[PDB]
Design a protein around this ligand. Structure first.
Ligand SMILES: [Mg+2]
Ligand SMILES: [Mg+2]
Ligand SMILES: [Mg+2]
Ligand SMILES: [Mg+2]
Ligand SMILES: [Mg+2]
Ligand SMILES: [Mg+2]
Ligand SMILES: [Mg+2]
Ligand SMILES: [Mg+2]
Ligand code: NA
Lengths: 66, 152, 96, 252
RNA sequence: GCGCGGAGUCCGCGCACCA
RNA sequence: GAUACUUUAAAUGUGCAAACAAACCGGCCUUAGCCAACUGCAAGGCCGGAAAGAAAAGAAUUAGAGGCACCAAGUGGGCCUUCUUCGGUAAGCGGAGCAGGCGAUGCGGAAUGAACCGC
RNA sequence: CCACCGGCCCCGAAAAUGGAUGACGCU
RNA sequence: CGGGUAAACGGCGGGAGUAAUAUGACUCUCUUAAGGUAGCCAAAUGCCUCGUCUUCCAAUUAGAGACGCGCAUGAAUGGA
RNA sequence: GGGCGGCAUAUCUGUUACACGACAACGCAGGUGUCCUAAGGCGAGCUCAGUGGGAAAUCUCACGUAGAACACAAGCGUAAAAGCUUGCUUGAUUAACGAUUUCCAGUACGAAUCGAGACUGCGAAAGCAAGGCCAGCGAUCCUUUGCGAUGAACAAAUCAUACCAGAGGUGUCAGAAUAAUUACCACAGGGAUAACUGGCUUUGGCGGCCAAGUCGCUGAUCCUUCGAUGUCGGCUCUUCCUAACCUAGCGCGACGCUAAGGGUUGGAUUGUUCACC
RNA sequence: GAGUACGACCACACUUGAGUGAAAACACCAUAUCCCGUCCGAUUUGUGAAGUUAAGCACUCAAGGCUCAGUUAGUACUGAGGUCAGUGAUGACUCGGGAACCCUGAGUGCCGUACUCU
């Protein structure tokens, strides 16, 4: 009454193919990483965002000048 | 069916080679591992802390996290119709630096050297020739290939 | 299993907080109250005709219990509960 | 009686490491000493190796590499004659001097000699070393003693005190110094100073001369006519000589 | 689990029973 | 060993890589990260360079458009064969591994035959 | 003229309605 | 907790071993609430079993009379 | 088949298993519901099993690659140790809802890995330690203990309740509270499944063939049939086979070859087939 | 050409038996009032320098082992194929991959940092 087999299973699994893994650059979250390095990286990223805003303002002013 | 534990059926997998027992060495201790490196996961049976499951014993992956004594590695695992990216945590005794990209790095270096020489104007090395071309063969020894009475 | 009578630890609890002695007691369940909500509900359900209205457990299989200790230190009044492995005896002495 | 080391005995035999067979290195301790946090991606770490022979003392600063250890700087107790010490090598005072000499040379090489002057005054006191693990931080190294037994008053700790007073950071507790009392859990700076300057040597030398007055120990002192009540002064002068010229070595 | 006895442990008696 | 456990060790397998969100060469900014310190190391960015866009040496090929969702059916009694096999004296017997079939399929062959040969 | 090894064929080879290289036949 | 009661429901072994070729009047042990008494039987109740002896027939796995190591007969669950 | 028996119902090791992983049978050989304040943590000193030579079990010297030990089954692992002796200890505590592995639906439970913070232990130091590596365990509701908002017209003290963390248990172990009998019997179905023929395979029969072990010619399964294929023996009647009892021929009183044309009985006891007179 | 201290790989470095050892060093060796530890200054700890290469150590030389080649051998085994041969066990063939033990030949450590001597 309790049958077990793997007979048709590989054939089923290959109809819609074995999908490849997601590339390394997507879904690259850092949650659960070693805490001190994470804390430092956050501060660096905040400074970088401030710099990006300043650079855009300078570009806008330069274009308005010429 | 009756017994399925964490280390079941690892009698020959988690064993040391003949006349090669012992513990890791200072070369293993002094190896530097960075995030983004390719590593091989090979279980060291004499440590027993932070050992991976037997499924991961021969796989290669990418480091995503370094701790004071541990490494986090990403390893592909097919399940039914897809490939999952599993994150395993191990001690540094159980990993090695992978040489899976040596040929590619060498190819880039040789390309850079060739570019430097071509811009310098230095003479280039002579390119290799094919081994499948024709030619005249001058023989030293000729024999007779035969099946003889004494052969049997 | 044997456990020591006294144990040294801090036990701050808004007082000295330094590593001092503890007084160790073994937890025992209190007596069930007649006016607990749930006891009142069961009594109201059981009154009248109909017989037993809730299941009664019969098929015991466990032979042991977990041990709970209550730890309390001088001055600092708080109590801390700690859990030990299952055992059959649990003597609470320090003879060695 | 069958032989033990037969043919099948050699085929299944695994040899130990070379230096284990020669009985020189304790690899179990060496692994823990060379180990470092993996998050510190191979930043430098230093050992102070102390090795005492029959007739000399050796002290070097070592960093471990895969190709082989490199020695940052080394000092030997056998060159102390060039500073003013003779007939009394390999004792506790010469150990103190060797440590202080190594520290002075090391700070001088690394260019931080003026900063971290050490303790110009000599005393067998205790002062916990300042470390980040707890103002510019002092140069740091951890002590390596090898197979030597770590008993109270042993000369390895005198070598250590020499460097600590020379101005190095070596983490330590004062529990193995000559003046320490275990039951009371305190240190006797007076006794430690006595052993630093070598009063016990003078007491022994007086005793042996007074006894031998009637009718081979301390033969070189007795032959060269070295007198008591000058040993402390000689050591105290040697300390200043080192702090003035840290590199003045044996001639030619 | 609650009361009695008899040598927190045990022994009997009669009672109680929603994980 | 006993009187099959094992140093050695295949064939068939199996993980990773092989230049366009990637990697290589030099400025510079930032971090209450590591280090005795930084002109070293770690991390995130900005400004530049190079680019047989991957040579030659047997030095790939493709009836080769990648990814992401939503809603829902039937099914959850299988059976036969090839090569491995465990139980059983054996079975058109029971239990498994890999692949192909019938079930759901006729047609052309083996006089005849769900599953053989060809298609 | 002997000892052994082959190829075809012949003994070894005994059941229950009359019957099957598919049938006839073929040397 | 103490008494009583089987023409109340029912029960009547665990067994062993000794003795005058045989055998056991004879002895010893184990043991129960008690240890099958008077009777009766291969019975409409006996597995082995077509038991063994006698009779009935030319010949009887059937019938009758005897015997009793009774798988598992027996006293108003009534015996003869 | 079902019942009886058992647990193959939670759970571990070696094999089955086919050099990644996965892989079954009331398959094989064995284990588990506990035990330990040390048998947990750390530092130091030391080397074990055994063998050989000595001294009115113990003392001594040499050798001794693990052949011993590590609570308990097994497999891996380990020698200035992971074993043995010893000193000090309680990291077997707490741990802001960090991340992950195994099972796997990529849910939970149990077990495990890498961490951040507190308070500590041992050590001169680097370090090591949040149990004894790997089996040793448990939802909702209810009860109960520890810790720091509500009872709606207001207020006080009791009492009840609430958020968070544990404990009391479900072994059929992802968790109803459960005894028999039917030959007086019933219903819905099943050839998914037994009792009878038939099929496969073996059995037991049964003597032959070379040589003097060898080589051949009742059971077990569950395929068909539960909107039914009438189940033993005797009587009656026909037909076929040979592995020859008689009758017919041969070769050597018995033994062998050809030959299936003709024949092969009446009764006592028993339902008997057999058996026996 | 050597030595010492720390080492990486961890027998071409190990085990057994002999011979040689310039100077430096390393080591045996002397000792026990103090620091410290034992039944025992044996081990260990402190303080020394009379003697010695006798041992340790290093080098060289002969056997078991170890390491790298050859043979064994296109053998054993094996991926793919047949309306192949054989009652069958099994076998050969066609397109590919391809061992091991035994036996035999050769050798017997090598690479770093610091300081010293002839
Ligand atoms: Mg169908
Ligand atoms: Mg077809
Ligand atoms: Mg009778
Ligand atoms: Mg009659
Ligand atoms: Mg009669
Ligand atoms: Mg912590
Ligand atoms: Mg309740
Ligand atoms: Mg059927
Ligand atoms: Na035909």
């Amino acid at each position: 009454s309790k049958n077990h087999t793997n007979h048709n299973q590989s054939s089923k699994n290959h109809r819609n193919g074995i999908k490849g893994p997601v590339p390394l650059h997507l879904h690259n979250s850092k949650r659960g990483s070693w805490l001190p390095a994470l804390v430092n990286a956050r501060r660096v990223r905040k400074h970088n965002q401030k710099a990006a805003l300043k650079k855009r303002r300078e570009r806008i002013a330069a274009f308005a000048a010429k | 069916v009756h017994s399925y534990g964490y280390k079941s059926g690892t009698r020959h997998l988690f064993a040391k080679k003949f006349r090669k027992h012992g513990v890791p060495s200072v070369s293993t201790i002094l190896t530097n591992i960075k995030v983004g490196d390719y590593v091989d996961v090979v279980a060291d049976s004499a440590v027993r802390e932070g050992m991976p499951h037997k499924y991961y014993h021969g796989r290669t992956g990418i480091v995503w996290n370094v701790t004071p004594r541990g490494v986090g590695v990403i390893i592909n695992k097919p399940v039914r119709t897809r490939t999952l990216r599993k994150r395993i945590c191990v001690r540094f005794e159980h990993v090695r630096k992978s040489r899976c990209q040596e040929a590619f790095k060498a190819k880039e270096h040789q390309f850079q050297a060739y570019l430097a020489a071509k811009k310098a104007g230095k003479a280039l090395p002579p390119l290799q020739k094919s081994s499948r071309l024709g030619g005249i063969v001058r023989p030293k020894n000729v024999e007779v290939l035969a099946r003889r009475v004494a052969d049997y | 299993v044997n456990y020591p009578k006294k144990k040294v630890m801090h036990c701050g609890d808004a007082r000295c907080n330094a590593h001092k002695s503890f007084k160790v007691v073994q937890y025992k369940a209190g007596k069930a109250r007649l006016f607990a909500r749930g006891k009142r509900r069961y009594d109201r359900k059981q009154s009248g005709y109909g017989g037993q209205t809730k299941p009664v457990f019969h098929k015991k299989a466990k032979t042991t219990k977990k041990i709970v200790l209550k730890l309390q230190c001088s001055g600092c009044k708080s109590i801390r509960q700690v859990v030990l492995k299952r055992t059959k005896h649990f003597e609470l002495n320090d003879k060695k | 009686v069958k032989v033990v080391k037969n043919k099948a005995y050699f085929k299944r035999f695994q040899v130990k490491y070379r230096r284990r067979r020669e009985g020189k290195t304790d690899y179990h301790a060496r692994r823990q000493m060379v180990l470092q946090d993996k998050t510190k991606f191979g930043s430098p770490k230093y050992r102070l190796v102390v090795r005492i022979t029959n007739k000399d003392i050796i002290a070097q600063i070592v960093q471990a590499k895969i190709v082989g250890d490199e020695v940052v700087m080394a000092a030997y107790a056998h060159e102390l004659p060039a500073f003013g010490i003779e007939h009394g090598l390999t004792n506790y005072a010469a150990a103190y001097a060797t440590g202080l000499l190594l520290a002075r040379r090391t700070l001088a090489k690394l260019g931080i000699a003026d900063k971290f002057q050490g303790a110009k005054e000599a005393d067998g006191s205790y002062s916990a070393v300042r470390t980040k693990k707890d103002e510019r931080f002092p140069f740091k190294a951890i002590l390596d003693v090898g197979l030597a037994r770590t008993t109270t008053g042993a000369r390895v700790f005198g070598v250590l005190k020499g460097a600590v007073d020379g101005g190095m950071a070596v983490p330590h507790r004062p529990n193995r110094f000559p003046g320490y009392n275990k039951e009371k859990s305190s240190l006797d700076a007076k006794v430690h100073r006595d052993r630093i300057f070598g009063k016990h040597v003078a007491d022994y030398l007086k005793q042996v001369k007074e006894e031998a007055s009637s009718n081979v120990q301390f033969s070189k002192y007795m032959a060269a006519k070295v007198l008591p009540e000058s040993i402390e002064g000689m050591y105290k002068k040697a300390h200043a000589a080192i702090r003035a010229d840290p590199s003045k070595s044996l001639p030619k």
